[PDB]
Amino acid sequence: EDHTEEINDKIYSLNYNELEVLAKNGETIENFVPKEGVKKADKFIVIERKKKNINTTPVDISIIDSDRTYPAALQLANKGFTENKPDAVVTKRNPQKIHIDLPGMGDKATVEVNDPTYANVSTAIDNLVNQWHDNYSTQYTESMVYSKSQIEAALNVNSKILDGTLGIDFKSISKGEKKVMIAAYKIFYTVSANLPNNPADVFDKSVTFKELQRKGVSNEAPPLFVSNVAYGRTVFVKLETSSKSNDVEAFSALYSDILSSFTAVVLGGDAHNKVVTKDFDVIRNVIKDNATFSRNPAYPISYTSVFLKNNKIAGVNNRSEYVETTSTEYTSGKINLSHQGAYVAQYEILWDEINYDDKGKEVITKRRWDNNWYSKTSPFSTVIPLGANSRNIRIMARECTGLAWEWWRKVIDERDVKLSKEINVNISGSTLSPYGSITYK
Amino acid sequence: DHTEEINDKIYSLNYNELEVLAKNGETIENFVPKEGVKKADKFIVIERKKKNINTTPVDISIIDVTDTYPAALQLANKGFTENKPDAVVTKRNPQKIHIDLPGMGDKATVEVNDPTYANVSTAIDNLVNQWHDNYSGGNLPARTQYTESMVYSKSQIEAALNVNSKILDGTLGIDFKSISKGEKKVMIAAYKQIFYTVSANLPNNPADVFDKSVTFKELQRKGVSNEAPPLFVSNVAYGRTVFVKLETSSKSNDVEAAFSAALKGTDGKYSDILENSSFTAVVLGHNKVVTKDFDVIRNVIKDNATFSRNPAYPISYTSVFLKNNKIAGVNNRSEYVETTSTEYTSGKINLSHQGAYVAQYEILWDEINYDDKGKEVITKRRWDNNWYSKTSPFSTVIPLGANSRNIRIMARECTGLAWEWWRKVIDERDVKLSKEINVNISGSTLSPYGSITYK
Amino acid sequence: NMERDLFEKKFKEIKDKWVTDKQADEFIETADKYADKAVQMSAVASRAEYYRMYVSRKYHYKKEFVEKLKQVYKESGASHVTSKKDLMLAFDDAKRKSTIGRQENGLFVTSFAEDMALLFTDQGKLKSADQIENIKDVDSGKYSDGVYQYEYDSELTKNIDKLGYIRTASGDTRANSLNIPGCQTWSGKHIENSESELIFPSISVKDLKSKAVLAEIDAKGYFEIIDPTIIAPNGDHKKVTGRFKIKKMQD
Amino acid sequence: NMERDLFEKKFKEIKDKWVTDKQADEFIETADKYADKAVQMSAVASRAEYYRMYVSRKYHYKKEFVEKLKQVYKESGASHVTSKDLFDDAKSTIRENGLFVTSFAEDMALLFTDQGKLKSAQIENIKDVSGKYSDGVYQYEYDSELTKNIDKLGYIRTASGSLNIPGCQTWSGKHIENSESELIFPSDLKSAVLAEIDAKYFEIIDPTIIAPNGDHKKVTGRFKIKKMQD
């Protein structure tokens, strides 16, 4: 019998949410402290953790040759598709036209493969590109790195490939020790496969719906048809520093002392061209050097599929959450007091020390110099240590004029004193005109 | 005949009449105007004033032995000023004497032809007895010469009463040591009652009292010199003396006033002084009586103004310088110390807090002392729990020395109102030093009350 | 003296490990001042009686003295100064059992009047947190996040007393090992900071959270419980008419 | 510490028999505090230098320090607090050995409140003296002009080698906040003058001072004697 009407009926009847059957829900974010601080020698290292969300639905799916993706291929819409490991559906197929967008080719761009297996379509792709070279002759993404799920969604590239080609230290990016950024350079041509008039038209008369179910077709894994493959070369760039400045990301160059270590990779066929420098212009000319289409050929890089039921484009929805880690390091300081005035002086020196509870909220320890309001004459001087976590530093020095209406006048009154290694607070002058200043060294 | 020699040579005598019979008292030595002495719970403050007396009596007192009589001749020297004079006994011309007993006419005057002590005394005895027999009935004026003084020293009371102090201490009993300490206050009064006086005409010339046999060398042998010029006894008074002593141990300020009033006959503030006073009356010859009833004294004085054959005694005489016929005086000059005393007693502040609130006290006072010059020395004292918060039933005893003064006591309590954080309950300056100063506070926070009462 | 010597040595045994030799010497040298204050309160009749009481650890007073001591508490109420941290633990720490005070053991208080006389100046402004820490003989910086106060008002205090719930501290309940007899706290050479000491029933704060309370305290200045539920000495919960307030001390 | 031991020991030797052990062990246990005060004033460079100077009883310091220390004496004058202990007894001096003194600006900031009111005779605790300021408190005031001319003559001295300590600083027990700088200033009237204090101070103009060699000298500038009034 002619199974065409059953295959069309059953595929038409398939029951699934398009969004949800290709949902790629990210790695579950485990409990975390928003802020933490650690004392080490004269240092205070503060790790700050911000929780963020990614939500993308790419319709171009990264290809990993580590194959079963090719124009007019049949795949299953399951979790394995969402992690660049699609399952194919291999049956006896029917004549299928493909088309390549190479510039000058006219009707010679279209070609009909009688039996469209991977081999036959690869052969036609091979012929077509060769002819163009003989007789006839880009998308860029950048993003900082926070976790494999985030960098995947941000660049639409599998994280294992990145991790294989460039070192990515996720565990220790989480400690704020490394600010890593990655750029992708994804081009030369696209082969496309005409969409069937009806779902059954891709199958031969011997293919039955029961056979399709045996190879995986269900409401939980609806059939997908590969309509377009993009070919070319990808150029991965990594920029890795151990700085802690907020300005690191603006790396984005795609002036600065920060410039640290670099890496660039050109995707070869097999699993490449790994180069690592401490100067960028070597890399940045490497990209242009790796930009020629010759018989340096072109490799699969991404592809587009439709649901066979209704030829709706298949998007993999990435709805996931990650952590931004920000690390800052403070250094203890010293308040240097020096009194060179001809009057009696008194100080009020106040600051807070800051720590974080296991819930990550800030705990303020108030703090005062034990000689506040003690009288001081010249040439008094002293050194007042401030810990690396000091904050809200208030320094006041005041003068006993002894006038019966202003017994004391403020000479110095700062309230937002910079914690620095040296806080030099000098006062001098006469009783009638005092002078004071705070400098930083 | 040495009359012209006696005249010329006596006239040549060169002395100062005032100084030759001057009697100088010992001059008060180093002394402190104020002393403070602490015994047990007592503070005794002695106060001293230095005073001066300058008298020149011309009636000189007679002691007892006296062989002084009208027309006697004596030496103006030291011993005269001490009522123990030196006689100049030579042979004498006749001397007229006159007694002043009333009613005798020309029989009041007689001429003693050998005017020794024995002869004049006999002539007077004859005058006086003839007056008793033939004139006393049918003619006597009472003549009383009265003096009173507080007793401060031997010399002072001698000047003040014109009576030898040895006779006063012998007959009465004067405790000068107790007077100096501020322990005894003493008054002495002397009733000299003159029944008669015998007088003796002044010689027209100095030699006239002397027999023609007398030489100036005989007078120099007998003591006559510029150092001790001769004296003629012109008058002697006879009668009786009554000494009254009023003694007390009170330090009151009115003891002299109470004493004068009793003597004066002045008829109850003084009753406290007089009931704790002792009285001594002596009538000289020694009829002595001690008693605590003052009428007994008044009775002695009234029962001894009687003149009969109880005769009269020499009690005082008047002398002139022979050279001059000028009345001889004895200048008493002396310093003495008036001593007062006051006794103060220690006290106690008793604090009792029975209120419903938190209270605080401020208790201040001064302690007085006297330096080696007798000037005040103020030690400020303060209670050491001043300003400390107290709640009921707090109580305590703050001892105050007997020399405390300027006692200030304040108690306040914490109302706790935004406009009135503390309110005073008691605020007192010059608190009376008493055995008990009872400081009570009580009431509520909004209506407190207190009082200082004394016991 | 005989009893003071016996006192000295009894102190050396019960004082805890972390009492400095300086504070302990201070406790020894001021001992007679605290005996005398107890005698003048008629808490005891004599130094001797006071030292025998400290040594015997039986803090037993005549009922007449305690009735007179309470007058100022009935008049003005009772006060317990606390740190912010200790406040939150009464509401938030479950092992604190949602009571203010050690449950049936009570809360150490002084009279409210005594704390207003002492923690404020002559003109009624709150003293610095340094001064108050010094007056209360707590560690430096303990009240740097503010000086908080529990307050039993007069009505609550009278009604608590009607029930016979007011207690006097005992020798084995009271500074931790610096407790002394006489219903009085020990305060160093500055005996003017010694306040009376009694034990009031704890307050139940069931279903209350420090968040709400501290929030109310910044808004109004105080959080209040009309007719609160106290913890009787036998452990019972019992509602007593009056006002119990929690507050942050303010000028 | 060989210096603390030598210090402690030498003070133990030289103190007066009648200073109470409460004084004496407070002095021993605040010594490190006063050593730190003198380092901070640059009177000495280290604690050992401070103790070594004490034990030697020769308080010699560097001119740079002493002239900087004097800036407040030249600016505000000097001040001596006395209670009574004030004159009428006999050599009409006020002692050719000099008068211990602090800067006028220092007494005025320490003995008055933040508004400007004089403290309660608290003042006894400040000068670590009890009951002696009860009459009241007097202050001998060298004015700034007198003071500058005193120093041109080179008449200002520092104490050398009981409770004396090096660093031109008064000892004041645990409350080192009441320690003031001490200097030695030079040295026919009676009492009588105190009337002029009840009436108004007592101001002498170009007074007759004493010198380290006992000579009298007549130095421009005011000198006042007063009861400290609030």
Author numbering:
A (entry chain C): 103 to 168, 171 to 241, 250 to 298, 300 to 363, 365 to 366, 368 to 369, 380 to 384, 387 to 398, ...
B (entry chain D): 104 to 167, 169 to 171, 173 to 244, 246 to 373, 378 to 395, 401 to 424, 426 to 571
C (entry chain A): 194 to 366, 368 to 445
D (entry chain B): 194 to 276, 278 to 280, 284 to 287, 290 to 293, 295, 297 to 322, 324 to 331, 333 to 364, ...
What does the paper say about this structure?
Group A Streptococcus (GAS) is a strict human pathogen possessing a unique pathogenic trait that utilizes the cooperative activity of NAD+-glycohydrolase (NADase) and Streptolysin O (SLO) to enhance its virulence.
Diffraction-quality crystals of C-terminally His-tagged NADase193-451,G330D in complex with tag-free SLO106-574 were produced, and the crystal structure of this complex was determined to a resolution of 2.45 Å by molecular replacement. The overall structure of the NADase193-451,G330D/SLO106-574 heterodimer exhibits an elongated shape with the C-terminal domain 4 of SLO bound to the C-terminal enzymatic domain of NADase. A common polymorphism G330D, with the presence of aspartate instead of glycine at position 330 of NADase, lacks detectable NADase activity. Among the interacting residues, NADase residue D315 forms the only salt bridge with SLO residue R531. The SEC profile showed NADaseD315R and SLOR531D co-eluted in a single peak at the same elution volume as the wild-type NADase/SLO complex, indicating NADaseD315R/SLOR531D restores the ionic interaction required for complex formation.
